[PDB]
Amino acid sequence: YYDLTSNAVLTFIYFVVCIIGLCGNTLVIYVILRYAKMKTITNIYILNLAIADELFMLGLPFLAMQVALEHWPFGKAICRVVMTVDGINQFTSIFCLTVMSIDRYLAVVHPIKSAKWRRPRTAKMITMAVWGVSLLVILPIMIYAGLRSNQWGRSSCTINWPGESGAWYTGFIIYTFILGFLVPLTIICLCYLFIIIKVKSSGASTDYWQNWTFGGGIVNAVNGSGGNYSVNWSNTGNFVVGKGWTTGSPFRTINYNAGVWAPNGNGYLTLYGWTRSPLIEYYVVDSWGTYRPTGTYKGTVKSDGGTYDIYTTTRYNAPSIDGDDTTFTQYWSVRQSKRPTGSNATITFTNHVNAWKSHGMNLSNWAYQVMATEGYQSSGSSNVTVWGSSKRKKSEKKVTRMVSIVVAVFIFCWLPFYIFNVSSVSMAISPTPALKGMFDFVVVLTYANSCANPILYAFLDDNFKKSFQNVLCLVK
Ligand SMILES: C[C@@H](c1c[nH]c2ccccc12)[C@@H](NC(=O)N1CCC(n2c(=O)[nH]c3ccccc32)CC1)C(=O)N[C@@H](CCCCN)C(=O)OC(C)(C)C
């Protein structure tokens, strides 16, 4: 009914967590406070999370003695103090995360309007509020923290039942679960749902998947991660495979990377699209296999470091997007040599479209445009990644990503705890070695959340990584 070894290893784990968390959080406070580079709005919130996590670790020694002994040695007064400091830091931790996500939501979705809300001085007022609000929310712990006898004949520091009624303890569980966990997370996740809706709503990412085969041979096409796709084809008839946009527009730039462009015979690596009113079919060909497409020569365009020929053809009794035996016109621009592949590359489409209307080639009802692999009576392989361009900087994409991962780790560490607590309300007082270790574990997992954050910043933020290596990496 008691496992001294299983108790000792858990007391050891408490102490390891305390150390790892005080190192990393001290490191995070130092680099933000010392270096000019780190003075960013987001880092005002991280600093406060770091100060909260730092103070959180300071209570761990006291609590480890209670894990090892199932006894509180330091009297009633220090019990109230530790429970009160512990609580303030618990709730300032998650309220900081909440405000931080609200800040990310404002930056992505309403950047122009909240130029005034994202000044350093008001983020400093916001964080002072966060500490104030926490102090109010933990007033119950303040009042009712105390000592309780246990079955071993010892005293535990816990929260005493107010008025000795299991009803008020139960209400306090519900209170802490709603304010400390459910309401912040609901705010954070709605914020991030609006962020990801918004981003996809821009043109930064592709939103269409083309995988059309007429039917002969094998066209093995993988719809990969994000804007990436691959195709393996052999002894085919006509096929076209690519990624792009469900509605095309003549002002969009297109970026791509042909990690593989390995045609064995006729296959075009090209941008491809249709229109209606009138029904035309357009191409900007950057590379090909054993055959270069052609038509009536009308001119040239220079773009993206290469020169293209302009061509036109006219199909009749030919397959379209409208019907199978229809008539339509094709507008080609075809590079003069094969553009190299294996590195990022642009197609500034409003260049090509303007030059066509010059030569009388003019495209109303827009249809899809994709960066495609086309083939005919050939074999080969390609691998391509496709993406627009954005108005928001890669540095702020990286910060916004990082907070989301910090939020996902928070959930992983604090959910077992709240699930146990909601259980405990249900008369679970059968203290057992199996459930008593379960409790000690599920609690130390909330503390280990403060160790993960500094490590998270080192792998997901370059400036935190550069600052850390500045301290930890020795030169001469
Ligand atoms: C009220 C909780 C709290 C205090 N402050 C809060 C602030 C917000 C939300 C809840 C709190 C506090 N719960 C408790 O006291 N009990 C006592 C009774 C326990 N029980 C049963 O009823 N049947 C059992 C059968 C087998 C085993 C245990 C059993 C479970 C719940 C707590 O979780 N205290 C932590 C400190 C962690 C505080 C988080 N920062 C603790 O004591 O951790 C050590 C010292 C390792 C034990």
Residue numbers in the entry: 37 to 239, 1000 to 1159, 1161 to 1184, 243 to 331
Provide passages from the article that reported this PDB entry:
Somatostatin (SST), an inhibitory hormone that distributes widely in both human central nervous system and periphery tissues negatively regulates multiple hormone releases (growth hormone, glucagon, insulin, gastrin and cholecystokinin) and cell proliferation through SST receptors (SSTRs). Here, we report five structures of SSTR2 and SSTR4 in different states, including two crystal structures of SSTR2 in complex with a selective peptide antagonist and a non-peptide agonist, respectively, a cryo-electron microscopy (cryo-EM) structure of Gi1-bound SSTR2 in the presence of the endogenous ligand SST-14, as well as two cryo-EM structures of Gi1-bound SSTR4 in complex with SST-14 and a small-molecule agonist J-2156, respectively. The overall structures of SSTR2 and SSTR4 possess the canonical seven-transmembrane (7-TM) architecture with an extended helix VIII in parallel with the membrane.
Crystals of both complexes were obtained in monoolein lipid phases and determined at 2.65 Å and 2.6 Å resolution, respectively. It slants from helix III to the hydrophobic cavity formed by helices VI, VII and ECL3 of SSTR2 and makes extensive interactions with the receptor. The tert-butyl ester of L-054,522 stretches to the hydrophobic pocket formed by helices II and VII, which would strengthen the hydrophobic interactions with L992.60, Q1022.63 and V1032.64 of SSTR2.
